[PDB]
């Protein structure tokens, strides 16, 4: 609860206020993660079961959860929960289906036909964390687009025992195989494959430090697999004007704060009275949270910044590029065209972060830690690839032949040039 | 050494024929490059000039190429060459402009508006190698989509002295700044920024072992920059049936072979007679190449494979996922629907690889070394980001509230749930 007046700040203080946590990729975390990966690649299920005996100690037998276990889990859930997941899946499906790239098919010049088509990533592995609270919503976010893309194989790993909600979500979204393996070992299992877990082309979904280091390592190994995106501390940046409701602002700052102790929570507002009221609201609301140590920790790094005007709020946000940008201003919609970097944007007073995290239809797997500079929100595109196709007719080729010969010759690529000459001469003979 | 009959091979030999040689990198190069990157970030232009002094005959002075130097270079080029580059850029521009994503704007349910909009990557840097032969075509392939995407800053680095062709291509495509810096130092200057070189968000363009290692390193450093794609040996796979012309097939195999000594060159054909005729044509054409040493080297790893039929050719190619796929068969277009993995596909007798490398309009920067499994041909998308936006109206929020509360409660994310309750209660108070 200490308001920062942006324009009273020296230039240095301003730079420091927008910095992100320095990375602490423990050489021990990298060492442990590397031994885990090598071990899993070298010994498969044997190594997996060993880690099962140590960590979380659940003594796994069959890595694959059976259809019977999934059916039993599904029967235990309430109809209220099942129906809410269905609303969410429907909206997530609607939004992601609308992302299908329309056909690209054009003749750049007569007889020179260029196309861009799409093909699904053949095999994808989804990761879901464990813990006492089940993060089943991520299953909906990952499995739905994979399904829409037409991915042939879709599997999922989560630390055992896997919660009923996660099993039901997986079945609901067509996940084919669910495996009792978590952490770095799960990522290694998906990247290299084992006797039970298939080697997949791409791995999706965030996790703890070990999971993050694992996804990092396998993405760089030739014998590994591609990953959806780099990771880092999560972030929320709320822009609030004088007409905002302090409790609504506070509720979103706390929604982000409970995500993890390293979460970055930032408010930008042109009114000191708004910052003060939000600070008070945050304090009152925090007092009502039962599991609040995580949020309390994240709030230690929060910044409630008073700017001189809305223009400065936009300028600061664009420089930062927040994972989640929440615009609680009376002209939110009008500001969208000016936002140049953010993972997901929430507009107005009735678009809580919670709406996007669970059921509006947008994806909650987003770039953070500054990766918004070049990465996008997870979407259909991440489960597919663009393939180029071209066909030149005799006429098209003939019209472009001299141009190609000239360019190849200037680059001194003789074989490239001769590929054209051979064809030009064959066409002359047949004319 | 000559013709491989696929079905005569053992299952193990078949798997080996589709493998890619694996080579990573020497500790020596990794060290050398890490030191260059650290020195450039720490000491800027001073470090760049020190590097230049050690390698160039004449130490670099102005790091930025002047408008005058660019103008003098343009004046020396022939009208023929300038006209050829204009045709190429026009076609590249047409195909890439056709890749613009249409608007994604949908109400998943009444009052719940979700959109996906695009924003450009703000600053991009392009790297172009030097050498005796000017590889200026890559400038057209990179700078054109950057312009279409609306990237605010587009700069280029190339080892001095930079050939007139590269300078003209840069100016033609709107590159703002061109810098006299090459190798790993250039990659570091773009990734970190120096007094003269702007720090860019993403770096495009392939290069030698040092450039490749520098791109790998900066892509993994939080203080670095993103890169277009991982690198590796290039590849061509031609599927040819009995109606193909041996010299045309051979010309495309040699076009790829001259790209580099590590290029993978593969022919799949149902006809042993075709394979023999192609092998002979390759030998005869190779003899006419001025500087055939690189092509000869790549050809030692070539595989001319005879299959049972075209369906088997498709099965093999799909398992491999070639960078470039050339289909010289009667019904080439019909086979495309069954192709599941390939960077760029060329159809029929008049679609030489050279056409796509230079002027049909498709991009020649493509995934290889197996990255076709999840990566796409470079396109407009690589110069931009997808950003999602959502706005719920009072009505839309009210209709979705219970669903969000249910899901948040099930995940035990109390703040996420309270964010909803606070708004529901505010609305009741209002009416």
């Amino acid at each position: 609860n200490t308001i920062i007046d942006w324009n009273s700040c020296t230039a240095e203080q301003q730079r420091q206020l927008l910095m992100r946590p320095a990375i602490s990729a423990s050489e021990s975390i990298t060492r442990t993660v590397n031994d885990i990966l090598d071990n899993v690649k070298a010994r498969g299920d044997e190594a997996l079961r060993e880690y099962s005996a140590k960590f979380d100690k659940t003594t796994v037998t069959a890595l694959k959860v059976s259809a019977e276990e999934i059916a039993a889990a599904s029967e235990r859930l309430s109809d209220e929960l099942k129906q809410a997941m269905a609303v969410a899946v429907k909206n997530i499906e609607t939004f992601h289906t609308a992302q299908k790239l329309p056909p690209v098919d054009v003749e750049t010049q007569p007889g020179v036909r260029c196309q861009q088509v799409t093909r699904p990533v053949a095999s994808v592995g989804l990761y879901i964390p464990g813990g006492s609270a089940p993060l089943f919503s991520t299953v909906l976010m990952l499995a739905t687009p994979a399904s829409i893309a037409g991915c042939k194989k879709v599997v999922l790993c989560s630390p055992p025992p896997i919660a009923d909600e996660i099993l039901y979500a997986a079945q609901l979204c067509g996940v084919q195989d669910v495996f009792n393996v978590g952490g770095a070992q799960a990522i290694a299992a998906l990247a290299f494959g084992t006797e039970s877990v298939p080697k997949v082309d791409k791995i999706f979904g965030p996790g703890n430090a070990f999971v993050t280091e694992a996804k990092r390592q396998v993405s760089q190994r030739l014998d590994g697999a591609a990953i959806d995106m780099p990771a880092g501390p999560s972030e929320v940046l709320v822009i609030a004007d004088s007409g905002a409701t302090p409790d609504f602002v506070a509720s979103d700052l706390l929604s982000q704060a409970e995500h993890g102790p390293d979460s970055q929570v930032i408010l930008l507002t042109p009114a000191a009275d708004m910052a003060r009221r939000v600070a008070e609201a945050v304090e009152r609301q925090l007092a009502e949270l039962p599991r609040a140590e995580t949020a309390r920790q994240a709030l230690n790094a929060s910044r409630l910044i008073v700017t001189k005007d809305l223009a400065q709020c936009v300028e600061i946000s664009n420089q930062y590029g927040p994972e989640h940008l929440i615009i609680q201003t009376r002209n939110a919609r009008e500001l969208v065209d000016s936002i140049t970097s953010a993972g997901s944007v929430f507009l107005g007073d009735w678009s809580p972060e919670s709406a996007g995290d669970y059921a509006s239809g947008t994806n909650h797997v987003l770039p953070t830690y500054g990766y918004t500079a070049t990465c996008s929100s997870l979407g259909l595109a991440d489960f597919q690839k663009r393939m180029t196709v071209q066909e030149l007719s005799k006429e098209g080729f003939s019209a472009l032949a001299s141009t190609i010969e000239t360019l190849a010759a200037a680059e001194r690529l003789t074989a490239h040039k001769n590929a054209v000459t051979l064809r030009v001469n064959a066409l002359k003979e047949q004319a």
Side-chain angles (χ1 to χ4, degrees), chain A:
Chain A
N1 187 320
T2 52
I3 315 306
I4 296 170
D5 180 71
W6 184 261
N7 299 284
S8 297
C9 281
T10 63
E12 180 42 38
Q13 292 177 302
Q14 287 183 1
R15 220 44 181 293
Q16 175 275 176
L17 289 168
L18 264 40
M19 296 288 292
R20 288 162 156 108
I23 180 180
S24 178
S26 300
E27 265 191 321
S28 61
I29 290 178
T30 299
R31 67 180 296 86
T32 293
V33 165
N34 177 255
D35 291 318
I36 294 169
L37 302 200
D38 297 325
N39 195 196
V40 171
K41 181 186 176 184
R43 305 191 301 105
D45 292 350
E46 178 176 62
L48 293 185
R49 295 203 179 81
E50 303 180 338
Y51 295 124
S52 179
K54 275 72 174 179
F55 292 68
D56 190 294
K57 118 111 101 175
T58 54
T59 62
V60 57
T61 49
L63 272 297
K64 175 176 162 67
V65 178
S66 70
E68 308 82 79
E69 296 170 319
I70 289 162
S74 304
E75 183 283 327
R76 286 189 291 269
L77 302 194
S78 71
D79 291 329
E80 175 196 348
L81 180 51
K82 291 179 185 177
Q83 291 144 1
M85 287 204 217
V87 172
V89 173
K90 182 180 189 294
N91 291 346
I92 291 165
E93 182 173 23
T94 296
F95 183 58
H96 288 72
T97 293
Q99 295 171 26
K100 288 179 175 193
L101 301 184
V104 177
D105 182 353
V106 59
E107 281 185 38
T108 50
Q109 51 184 268
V112 183
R113 187 178 178 190
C114 298
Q115 294 168 86
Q116 181 191 80
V117 296
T118 58
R119 289 295 184 273
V121 169
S123 182
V124 300
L126 318 181
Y127 185 75
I128 307 290
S132 57
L135 287 299
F136 68 85
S137 63
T138 299
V139 176
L140 309 187
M141 297 297 165
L142 299 184
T144 303
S147 166
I148 296 166
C151 295
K152 292 180 58 293
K153 181 173 292 299
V154 179
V155 301
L156 176 157
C157 298
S158 194
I162 298 174
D164 291 346
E165 295 86 352
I166 289 175
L167 299 183
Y168 179 78
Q171 187 61 36
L172 183 65
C173 301
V175 172
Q176 298 152 9
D177 300 286
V178 178
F179 300 105
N180 291 304
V181 58
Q185 52 273 18
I187 307 297
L190 292 167
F192 308 134
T194 69
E195 299 95 330
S196 309
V197 184
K199 173 174 165 73
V200 304
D201 296 315
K202 195 167 172 179
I203 298 177
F204 299 74
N208 64 33
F210 291 104
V211 164
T212 279
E213 178 57 9
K215 290 179 61 179
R216 197 193 121 254
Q217 287 187 32
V218 305
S219 65
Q220 302 302 105
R221 299 172 59 139
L222 292 171
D223 63 1
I227 61 174
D228 53 352
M229 58 185 70
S234 291
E235 314 152 344
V236 71
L237 187 156
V238 183
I239 290 176
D241 63 6
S242 278
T245 293
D247 283 319
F248 290 2
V249 177
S251 77
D252 286 308
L253 295 178
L254 283 170
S255 283
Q256 181 63 233
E258 70 181 356
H259 181 274
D262 292 312
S263 270
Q264 302 301 292
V265 175
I266 298 166
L267 161 69
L268 301 182
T269 178
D273 168 74
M274 179 56 60
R276 182 179 63 254
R277 290 155 63 201
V278 167
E280 301 174 336
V282 170
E283 297 179 302
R284 305 188 288 274
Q285 288 179 36
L286 177 61
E288 305 221 40
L289 297 173
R291 308 163 192 60
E293 297 101 329
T294 287
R296 188 176 85 286
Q297 275 304 303
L299 289 170
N300 289 155
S302 66
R303 284 133 284 164
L304 304 185
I305 298 172
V306 178
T307 64
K308 73 186 185 79
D309 57 29
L310 282 178
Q312 202 167 56
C313 289
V314 169
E315 290 160 37
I316 292 161
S317 187
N318 283 335
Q319 289 178 46
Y320 187 77
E323 178 189 7
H324 304 96
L325 171 59
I326 303 181
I327 310 183
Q328 282 180 35
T329 68
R330 271 88 288 293
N331 63 334
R333 169 63 60 184
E334 299 94 306
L335 294 186
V336 174
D337 280 14
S338 73
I339 297 305
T340 58
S341 194
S344 192
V345 186
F346 297 73
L347 302 180
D349 295 333
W350 316 101
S351 306
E353 179 176 68
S354 284
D357 276 354
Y358 292 111
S360 71
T362 61
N363 207 294
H364 76 208
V365 179
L366 305 165
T368 186
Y369 201 29
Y371 285 112
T372 43
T374 70
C375 297
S376 297
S377 162
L378 192 73
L380 185 71
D382 301 288
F383 293 83
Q384 62 191 196
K385 305 164 293 169
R386 290 171 284 110
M387 178 161 83
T388 285
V389 180
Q390 66 188 269
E391 180 171 30
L392 281 70
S393 64
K394 296 181 177 181
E395 296 67 35
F397 167 79
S398 289
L400 203 59
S402 296
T403 286
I404 301 168
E405 291 168 307
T406 291
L407 301 172
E411 291 200 335
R412 307 179 114 301
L413 283 176
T414 312
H416 276 74
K417 184 180 185 291
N418 291 350
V420 178
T421 296
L422 286 164
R423 290 165 169 81
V424 168
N425 285 339
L427 286 172
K428 281 176 184 186
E429 281 300 298
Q430 296 171 16

